[PDB]
Amino acid sequence: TCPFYKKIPGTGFTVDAFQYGVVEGCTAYFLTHFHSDHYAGLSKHFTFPVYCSEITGNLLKNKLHVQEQYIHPLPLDTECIVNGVKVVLLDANHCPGAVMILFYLPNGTVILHTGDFRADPSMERSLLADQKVHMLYLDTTYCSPEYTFPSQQEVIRFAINTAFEAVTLNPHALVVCGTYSIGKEKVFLAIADVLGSKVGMSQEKYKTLQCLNIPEINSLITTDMCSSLVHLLPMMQINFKGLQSHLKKCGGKYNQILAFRPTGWTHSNKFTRIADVIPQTKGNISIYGIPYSEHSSYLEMKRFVQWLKPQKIIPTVNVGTWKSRSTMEKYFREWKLEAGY
Numbered sequence: 001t002c003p004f005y006k007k008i009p010g011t012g013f014t015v016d017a018f019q020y021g022v023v024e025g026c027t028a029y030f031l032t033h034f035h036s037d038h039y040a041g042l043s044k045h046f047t048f049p050v051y052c053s054e055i056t057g058n059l060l061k062n063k064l065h066v067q068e069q070y071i072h073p074l075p076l077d078t079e080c081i082v083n084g085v086k087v088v089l090l091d092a093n094h095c096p097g098a099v100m101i102l103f104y105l106p107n108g109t110v111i112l113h114t115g116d117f118r119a120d121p122s123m124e125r126s127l128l129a130d131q132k133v134h135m136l137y138l139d140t141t142y143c144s145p146e147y148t149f150p151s152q153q154e155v156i157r158f159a160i161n162t163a164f165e166a167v168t169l170n171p172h173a174l175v176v177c178g179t180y181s182i183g184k185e186k187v188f189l190a191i192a193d194v195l196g197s198k199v200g201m202s203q204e205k206y207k208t209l210q211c212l213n214i215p216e217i218n219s220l221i222t223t224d225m226c227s228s229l230v231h232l233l234p235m236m237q238i239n240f241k242g243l244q245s246h247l248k249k250c251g252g253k254y255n256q257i258l259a260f261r262p263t264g265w266t267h268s269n270k271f272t273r274i275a276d277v278i279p280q281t282k283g284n285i286s287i288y289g290i291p292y293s294e295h296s297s298y299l300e301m302k303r304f305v306q307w308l309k310p311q312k313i314i315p316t317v318n319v320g321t322w323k324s325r326s327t328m329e330k331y332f333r334e335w336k337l338e339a340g341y
Ligand code: NI
Pocket: 033, 035, 094, 116
């Protein structure tokens, strides 16, 4: 049945709760972003109101074929009324169109649901600065101290430099980047830019990217693989077998592949620095795994919460085991005792 952490008390609202059929007493279903664990259940046959960002509404329409009459897009950073309740959507620093939602309850309670986010100090100067938050529904994906990773800027630096070097040494090398969902577009766009190429991809992926309001996008992407020296492929094809097969398809235009697998966190983050990462190699193929995260590190999460000083925290990730739950509750207590709220 719908879990309690997907219901907003004092309203007929749910968040990211599309796989439980009709939720008894829900008058509006909010969708924070277009990732499949979040939208799971939505289809062309859904007949309840969906509230979301403009970009998310472009994807629901074009990729899922949800009918237009049920899609309610809202602008960001704007006080809006939904079934009699004031709401604000804020940028989540996750994937394109990902939002956090502020609900202002009739009784005076204020609730923030982060959706999926990567906390940033820039958030401390949004509409959040303006008033108190009583309850926080938090993206706890990486809520443990061992989860460190570099900034997005440092990871892109490493990728740009690595690709630029390889292709300058061998102009017959192809660069390939793995994808399976929206998000992490900076990886393949930054690399294409340093190489003066457009990025080539399948028609289905091109379509997806045309929904995202990325400026000058037509100058940056294409469906003509031949004209482009950066190719996107399904993440599942980013292995030696899949890459050889793909090189075969390029008709002797290239004699080397350098590939990037953007992951979240991996255990090598505990020991190794970004400067020191090395690829997996077999023959004329090299695969780099790069830790490009669109979720809060442990420290970034802690800073955000200690700044906000909520009265109650409700985790939305890793809630399935008692040991996880107990571990998170310990950190919330440390944070609260350290900062004095
Ligand atoms: Ni997500």
